[PDB]
Design a protein around this nucleic acid. Structure first.
Ligand SMILES: [Mg+2]
Ligand SMILES: [Mg+2]
Ligand SMILES: [Mg+2]
Ligand SMILES: [Mg+2]
Ligand SMILES: [Mg+2]
Ligand SMILES: [Mg+2]
Ligand SMILES: [Mg+2]
Ligand SMILES: [Mg+2]
Ligand SMILES: [Mg+2]
Ligand SMILES: [Mg+2]
Ligand SMILES: [Mg+2]
Ligand SMILES: [Mg+2]
Ligand SMILES: [Mg+2]
Ligand SMILES: [Mg+2]
Ligand SMILES: [Mg+2]
Ligand SMILES: [Mg+2]
Ligand SMILES: [Mg+2]
Ligand SMILES: [Mg+2]
Ligand SMILES: [Mg+2]
Ligand SMILES: [Mg+2]
Ligand SMILES: [Mg+2]
Ligand SMILES: [Mg+2]
Ligand SMILES: [Mg+2]
Ligand SMILES: [Mg+2]
Ligand SMILES: [Mg+2]
Ligand SMILES: [Mg+2]
Ligand SMILES: [Mg+2]
Ligand SMILES: [Mg+2]
Ligand SMILES: [Mg+2]
Ligand SMILES: [Mg+2]
Ligand SMILES: [Mg+2]
Ligand SMILES: [Mg+2]
Ligand SMILES: [Mg+2]
Ligand SMILES: [Mg+2]
Ligand SMILES: [Mg+2]
Ligand SMILES: [Mg+2]
Lengths: 63, 144, 203, 58
RNA sequence: GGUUCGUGGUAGGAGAGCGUUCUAAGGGCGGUGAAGUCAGACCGGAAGGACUGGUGGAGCGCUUAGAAGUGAGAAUGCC
RNA sequence: GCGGAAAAAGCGGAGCCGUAGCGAAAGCGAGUCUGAAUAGGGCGCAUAAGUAACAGGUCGUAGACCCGAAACCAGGUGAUC
RNA sequence: GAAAGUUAUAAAUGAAGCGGUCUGGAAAGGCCCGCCAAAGACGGUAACAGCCCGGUAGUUGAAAUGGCUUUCCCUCCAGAGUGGAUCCUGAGUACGGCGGAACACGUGAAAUUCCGUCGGAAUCCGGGAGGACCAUCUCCCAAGGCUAAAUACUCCCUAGUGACCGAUAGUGAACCAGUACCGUGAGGGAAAGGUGAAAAGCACCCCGGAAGGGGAGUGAAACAGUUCCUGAAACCGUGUGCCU
């Protein structure tokens, strides 16, 4: 039977042109009084999935 | 049929484990010694990190899918040079020529490369640049 | 190449189309297609009973501990005399096709290879008034075939199949059915002019 | 034990906790023993309260 | 085709191979004795392969390719 | 799927992957998003190659390399002890 | 209900080598000659047969029973248009609340479908749906029923096929096997194929109570002797070249 896409990952990652996965930052809901404005600007942007993590999870989101 | 030689490199001999120590894949058959990964059907599920919260659960869900999303079929200019000067270019013409096979939502023209022939192109949408490049040559764009 | 009549006399010469019988043979493609066609002939009707399918088992033959015997879970465990087989054959298909263009290159190449080896004979026509194997054997001696030979006809020719049904090396096919494996299985390829047109119409 | 008119009877389903534990239960019809004429002859039969509503005669 | 530096090895990666059963094609052996089995002081770097003789009494190699129930000394394994 | 010999072809272009990406999305498009910005930066483009089939390696779903519990549940059989 | 046709259920006919030599127990094998083939399928026959046998291709065939297909008999049968005054068009129904379930959809914003319980329409100016809901538009007319085919499976039958097994395999079961045996019972559940081409299955003699043997004889072989193709290893012996 077809491999099943991991649906949690599909709601959180995006595939780029080159085939990398784009993601968002964690600490981006409440407890914002704690973080600095600089910290917030950075967290607000997107990130790429790390090499090691990609190796771990690439089959989960093939398709 | 008595001297078939398949293409060199096209076929290899499969590796059989657990057939003696000479092969180098005897006994433990490549699995090493003990633990979960040595067991039959053993192996943690795909993205499992042994109890560390998996990456996908450390990072938030984002966005939604638009029910009414419109993806267009793209036709960069360079491929319109395939047509003979004076010709008007409709969708159905781009089907017959086999430049687009499926026309999702419609045909959009984009400005990648450069056009040479005075066409009278009609597509569902146009890149500002594509419209400024068809006319630049000496052609009329109309939207359908 | 040369066109000869059923009797064996020279009838003229025919020009085979040089996109079908004239291309440089691709032996690698032919081998691939021959393997696929041999693999597709397979029936794959073979099964063994694993430990679930073998009659009985069910109960533990003796208690896990205390008896001084090896622990056992079923008299049908695979190390037991009449036990289930561990993997072994399961009914499956072996069939597979290469892409259409490869399968065409293959038939064109094997044909060109018959022409490169003077193994293709072209008859003006090939007809028998009634089914008569003696007449068919006489025909093959006139052509000087002697070996295994595939005969390719296409209508007009009638009573040929029956005439040659009881000869051991010789196989007769309409021009529509000309397959790589059938040509590979036969030293000489005897084809009527009428057939040649039919084969060129497809390739 | 079923309504003789409508066929209503016990059917099964789930009880559910606030926590969504499920355990099997039944829904019984609201059957009432009443004297009606089945085939002309009046006798005591189970009838659902729903069937007795308005129509039907005891 | 030669110079130079190498060639201990567990888990393990990589490579090239031996042998088993079956299929195809080709080419063979065999009642003047097949397979099997026994014996031997032969051959190959290994897996292994021959040859000769006994037993046996009817099937079996080889080549190229293909396919696998394909190789056991250990499981307090099963018979 | 049709036709056919459990053939071979032929027919079958529905669909699939690729040829464009960026954006949650509207959308714009060799750009795009962010942004007041003609700024910077992200991902892309400039620095084209895929696809079909087979074969090897590994992974996933299946018992998934083989053997082995104690237990659990369901339907029965037992008070000749 | 008939009739005709066809298929099934028994069958019939069916070409060509006693060919010559070699080996052999025996020839279907070797060598050398022929022949038939719409028949060179398979099997058997003293070793491997298209021409020896049963057959095979092809061609014929059915008193009887059943199946199928036509045709006849037999039975059964009203259809268009024009007008919407009036009438009818599925009620404890549809829907709703509450509790559940099914829907890929876990009560969710939850349409749609069903169950129990209670409440409960409109009913042609009428009604339902389009994923809460309202309006518009579009499509539809529930609460009555029937309906072949394409699909699923195989205890069976007929004909076949297999880069499926070949007696620890393949069915548990090639063999009088769900037997023997075990169990109060439900239930569990084996082992076990091969003389030879043909019984020609060892007359007769000898030792022995017999078993068993040695001769004689049969056979190609009996070291093929009624559990009798081959007959490995463990294991058990006898003899003796070297050592102790
Ligand atoms: Mg927030
Ligand atoms: Mg290897
Ligand atoms: Mg390896
Ligand atoms: Mg190693
Ligand atoms: Mg070992
Ligand atoms: Mg270990
Ligand atoms: Mg350890
Ligand atoms: Mg490990
Ligand atoms: Mg924790
Ligand atoms: Mg959210
Ligand atoms: Mg079982
Ligand atoms: Mg002990
Ligand atoms: Mg078995
Ligand atoms: Mg060294
Ligand atoms: Mg080394
Ligand atoms: Mg053998
Ligand atoms: Mg094995
Ligand atoms: Mg052992
Ligand atoms: Mg419990
Ligand atoms: Mg009782
Ligand atoms: Mg008592
Ligand atoms: Mg005869
Ligand atoms: Mg003789
Ligand atoms: Mg013999
Ligand atoms: Mg025989
Ligand atoms: Mg509704
Ligand atoms: Mg509800
Ligand atoms: Mg549900
Ligand atoms: Mg609604
Ligand atoms: Mg209700
Ligand atoms: Mg809506
Ligand atoms: Mg929806
Ligand atoms: Mg209605
Ligand atoms: Mg058995
Ligand atoms: Mg045996
Ligand atoms: Mg014996």
């Amino acid at each position: 039977p077809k491999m099943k896409t991991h649906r949690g990952s599909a709601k959180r990652f995006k595939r780029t042109g080159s085939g990398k996965l784009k993601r968002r930052h964690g600490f981006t809901s409440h407890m914002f009084a704690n973080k600095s404005q600089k910290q917030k600007r950075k967290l607000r942007k997107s990130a790429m999935v790390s090499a090691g993590d990609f190796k771990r999870i690439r089959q989960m989101v093939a398709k | 049929l008595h001297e078939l030689k398949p293409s060199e490199g096209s076929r290899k001999e499969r590796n059989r484990v657990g057939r003696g120590t000479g092969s180098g894949n005897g006994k433990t058959s490549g699995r090493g010694h003990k633990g979960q990964k040595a067991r039959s059907g053993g192996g943690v599920r795909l993205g499992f990190e042994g109890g560390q919260l998996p990456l996908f659960r450390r990072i938030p869900k984002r966005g939604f899918t638009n029910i009414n999303r419109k993806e267009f079929a793209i036709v960069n200019l360079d491929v319109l040079n395939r047509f003979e000067d004076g010709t008007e270019v409709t969708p159905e013409l781009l089907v017959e020529t086999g430049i687009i096979r499926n026309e999702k939502s419609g045909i959009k023209i984009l400005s990648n490369g450069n056009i040479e022939k005075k066409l009278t192109v009609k597509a569902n949408k146009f890149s500002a640049a594509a419209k400024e490049a068809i006319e630049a040559a000496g052609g009329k764009t109309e939207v359908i | 190449l040369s066109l000869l009549k059923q009797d064996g006399t020279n009838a003229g010469e025919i020009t085979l189309n040089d996109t079908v019988f004239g291309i440089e043979p691709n032996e690698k493609v032919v081998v691939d297609v021959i393997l696929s066609q041999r693999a597709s002939l397979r029936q794959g009707t073979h099964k063994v009973k694993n430990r679930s399918e073998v009659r009985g088992g069910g109960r533990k033959p003796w208690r896990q501990k205390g008896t001084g015997r090896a622990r056992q879970g079923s008299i049908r465990s695979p190390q037991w005399r009449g036990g289930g087989v561990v993997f072994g054959p399961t009914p499956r298909s072996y069939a597979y096709k290469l892409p259409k263009k490869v399968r065409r290159l293959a038939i064109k190449s094997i044909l060109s290879s018959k022409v490169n080896e003077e193994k293709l004979v072209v008859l003006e026509g090939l007809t028998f008034d009634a089914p008569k194997t003696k007449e068919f054997a006489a025909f093959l001696k006139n052509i000087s075939v002697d070996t295994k030979a595939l005969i390719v006809v296409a209508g007009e020719s009638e009573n040929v199949e029956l005439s040659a049904r009881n000869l051991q090396g010789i196989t007769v096919i309409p021009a529509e059915s000309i397959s790589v494996l059938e040509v590979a299985k036969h030293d000489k390829l005897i084809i009527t002019k009428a057939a040649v047109e039919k084969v060129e119409e497809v390739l | 034990k079923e309504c003789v008119i409508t066929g209503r009877k016990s059917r099964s389903g789930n009880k559910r906790s606030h926590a969504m534990n499920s355990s099997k239960r039944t829904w019984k019809a609201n059957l009432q023993k009443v004297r009606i004429l089945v085939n002309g002859k009046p006798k005591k039969v189970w009838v659902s309260a729903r069937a007795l509503k308005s129509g039907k005669v005891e």
